[PDB]
Amino acid sequence: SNQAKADAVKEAFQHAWNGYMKYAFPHDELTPVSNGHADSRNGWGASAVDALSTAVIMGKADVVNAILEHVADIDFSKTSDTVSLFETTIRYLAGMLSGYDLLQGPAKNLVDNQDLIDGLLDQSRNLADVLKFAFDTPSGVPYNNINITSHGNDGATTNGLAVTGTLVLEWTRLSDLTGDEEYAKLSQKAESYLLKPQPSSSEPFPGLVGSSININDGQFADSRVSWNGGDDSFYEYLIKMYVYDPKRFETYKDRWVLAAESTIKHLKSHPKSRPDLTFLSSYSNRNYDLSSQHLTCFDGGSFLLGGTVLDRQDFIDFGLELVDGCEATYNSTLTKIGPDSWGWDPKKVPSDQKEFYEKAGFYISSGSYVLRPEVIESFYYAHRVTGKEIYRDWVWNAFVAINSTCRTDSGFAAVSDVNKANGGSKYDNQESFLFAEVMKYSYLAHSEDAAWQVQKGGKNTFVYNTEAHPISVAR
Template sequence: MRLPSLSLLSAAASVVFGFRLPAPGNPEYQSLALKDRALRARQSRVTDSTVEQQRAAAVKDAFTFAWNGYFTTCKGQDELEPVTNTCTNPRNNWGASAVDALSTALVMGSQPIVTDILDYIATIDYTTTATEVILFETTIRYMAGMLSGYDLLEGPLSNLTTNASAVDTLLAQSKSLADSLSFAFNTSSGIPSNHLYFTNQTNDGATTNGLADIGTLCLEWQHLSDLTGDPSYGDLAQKAETYLLNPLPESNEPFPGLVGTNVNISNGVFLDATGGWNGGDDSFYEYLIKMYVYDSSRYSNYSDRWIMAADSTIKYLTSNPASRPDLTFLASYVNTTFVNSSEHLTCFDGGNFLLGGSVLGRQDYIDFGLALVNGCHDLYNSTLTGIGPEIFSWNTTGVDSTNEAFYHANGFYITDPLYDLRPEVMESFYYAYRITGNTMYQDWAWNAFVAINATTRVGQGFSAISDVDAANGGSFDNVQESFLFAEVMKYSYLIHAPDSIFQVASNGTKNQFVFNTEAHPLKVFGPPV
């Protein structure tokens, strides 16, 4: 069973009375839940637009609460540790939570927060840090966060600041960061190193880099080139990408379009045929179709490669658990041997198939994407907290007395019960609603948001929890990653927010923006699709 949804009552309390949604352990929660059942019985009397407004306002309230907790205690540092109300700096002490929060504050129209972040970003020195820099994480969080802020403030949300120089600074700081990172590509092949040290312009000495770490740079670095008029940034990422678009040796592409994970930095050759849509590989496939959305005239070859991967995924990786054949998950592979386990990270897959089907006019991809969304919804619908686990399996050889009943009822069993504030299920709900218009997906997103708020909210923020199938989520892990601001809050808000130019296209419209893997909307450069 799962905790009951607070539905309209909790949102209305936040909007009308100024209450915050109840936190874990708050006795108000059960009381509100009981009252909510009666309220939902009368929900047909409330217009859909009122429901959406109240839900969006409640999410904005939660975002503001978390932002105030972070910025009051940890301004200039990366993340708040909400249990101990202390700060941590896993992202080079450049203020990751602030930069990641900018595009969400913008789409929510939170002008005071936007002003605080713009003022802060102007003070960051991206040329120096004493700690290891991760190229992939820095690109998707910092660079994309600033480029997205620039696009939104130069375009549809220009009313949220009168400080033109602060907007220009976003682009200048993006360039400064890219200039600092560019030595990563100084290898014999052009495949970048992922772990960097600015103090002496070196790396960690690794001889390999991963599929997602290489293949999730092209959108941000190309967009920087397009905005600055300097092709060098995009050229670096595109050269690395060519090894992934034309993989060698052929044996390490076990299915058409589906490749291995580890790439030799010195020559760009794949070193294995292990892969799938799980973490470490995931956003390579995600960006293939998103580069086509970004510029369909320049990157049609990316969509060709995505179509190959999508067709092979449907043909070879589709898996229906024996105990619940109505569910659809994606297996991974080791060579041509399939592995029936998956991750919360993988649950972006439904949204990616939906986006691909929408822009390519392929109903089969849309239908498959919806099946994947339904499977990931059941992850949330099957646990005590109403939140999905980090890792799960439907491999029948792993079913024992401890998980047999759970597996037979739910079609999977939990192998890692952590919830790290991940956004992927909410992300796929968002795409499902935008592309189909079915309000069921709004309800699913709202229920997930209420469960996350009720279980992970602690102190002045939100924390990872140890066990999604334990009372109150087990224990708090005292981690509030910056992607809570960038992704969980943004998708939870936008699915209920009014239509706008930066939303994923719906009802036959064209995409004016494309979301990077950290949910930062970037303005498309080519003909909208």
């Protein structure tokens, strides 16, 4: 049963790995339709590094060794493109750190070359050392888009909420492993401005903050509240940091609790046609935006994690409602995969979607699916927290739908319309998170228990970064 299903996910992973190795390694990614390669992540081999933690968990030694040997020859000081501090941190930094924590712990018997394992930490340090100048601003709030050769930047005056608040987990982990406090200080100083928002008008409700921060003084530049892309990850890390080290980050937890409670009281929203469904809205100056994204579906998982860790049944109950809503956007489409974005504002229901809206509870704004993992991620937490089989079935149903409509001879491709036969048209794109997230969560939902699995209460010995890379907790 679950064993066969687990093996099935490993086959899907192996399939994409073979195609990637065949036509793109060591480039950042495989182009699944033309069977070529692309480098949207500075050319250090994003798909190889992001695939590391998943391969280790699946016990694929051949894949692990190949990736380790490539990590050893990466020169993080050279790239012809500008670098995103956020993307580089959540994929590359966390990916190598994750492999290190994994291979040094629960998976110690998988690789022989201890030198390639230790090389993971050395390279993580070299990478942070090349990127740390980004934090050298008046406030400590970094520039996200930098030029690592000239030390130049975007010229930007503000930095996004998520891009600013989704660095602390991995930069602090690097400090705890190297003994060098510099990494934690930099990231935590940047985070400090988010934990004590100013002006007060930038925090409409307790815990809910604006979407952008001034680099010059660290104050918010707007009061737009949301859990959507651009904001999401900030709230996710608030509670995860607490799981990482409850002693050092009790303050993060308090801030998340406030955010969680204000979200339930003010962002909760039900479609007119389906009062039984719950989604989250965005808030800006007393006005509500009744639309959401696939990205936002990570929310149910955040509420479930904090719920079990804090033993708050109300957060758990709410998380399941968010999970149900996201599952609704998946099982209502033709392909059984959810849309990239949707709405439920009665006044804006498109004429050609009137009847879909009336029965499904929402209209599709963007029907594309770019191999995102947020819905399966929350399904995974729901299963681990409640232990109910239904949530595991939803992960499987989604995986089969993805395997059936996105699969190409070499890998998996993004799709243009989840509400049309075979997904409409395939995009010649396969993001690295296919390896890091979609395949990991799908596999974990059906694989045997282990330390790297999400646990209930205070039993977690690993915490997942935003790219699904398992990081060992402190101490």
